[PDB]
């Protein structure tokens, strides 16, 4: 990971949505983002999406579901 953070357009060619789409998710408050804006004004400007938050949040989000549901589809392959 050279850089922690991507334009939220580049992160929408990631995930397969739309900008507009993910312009919308930052607004209902979905994503962790960082706000790259001229020093001189005040209110927005870039979006940048940070990686390891959105990460280590889908890591966190995953871990805190029960085993059950979390490690059952394993033994579909024959675990």
Same mark, same amino acid.
């Given at each position: 990971?050279? %850089?922690?953070? &991507?334009? #939220? /357009?580049?992160?929408? +060619? $990631?995930?397969?949505?739309? %900008?507009?789409? *993910?312009? !919308?998710? &930052?607004?209902?408050? +979905?994503?962790? *983002? &960082?706000?790259? %804006?001229?020093? /001189? ?5 870039? #979006? =940048? *999406? #940070?990686?390891?938050? =959105?990460?280590?949040? $889908? +890591? $966190?989000? #995953?871990?805190? !579901?029960? +085993?059950?549901? !979390?490690?059952? =589809?394993?033994? =579909? $392959?024959?675990?």
């Amino acid at each position: 990971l050279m %850089t922690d953070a &991507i334009p #939220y /357009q580049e992160f929408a +060619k $990631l995930i397969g949505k739309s %900008t507009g789409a *993910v312009r !919308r998710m &930052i607004d209902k408050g +979905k994503l962790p *983002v &960082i706000d790259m %804006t001229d020093p /001189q004004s005040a209110s927005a400007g870039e #979006y =940048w *999406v #940070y990686l390891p938050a =959105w990460n280590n949040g $889908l +890591k $966190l989000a #995953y871990e805190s !579901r029960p +085993k059950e549901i !979390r490690d059952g =589809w394993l033994m =579909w $392959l024959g675990l």
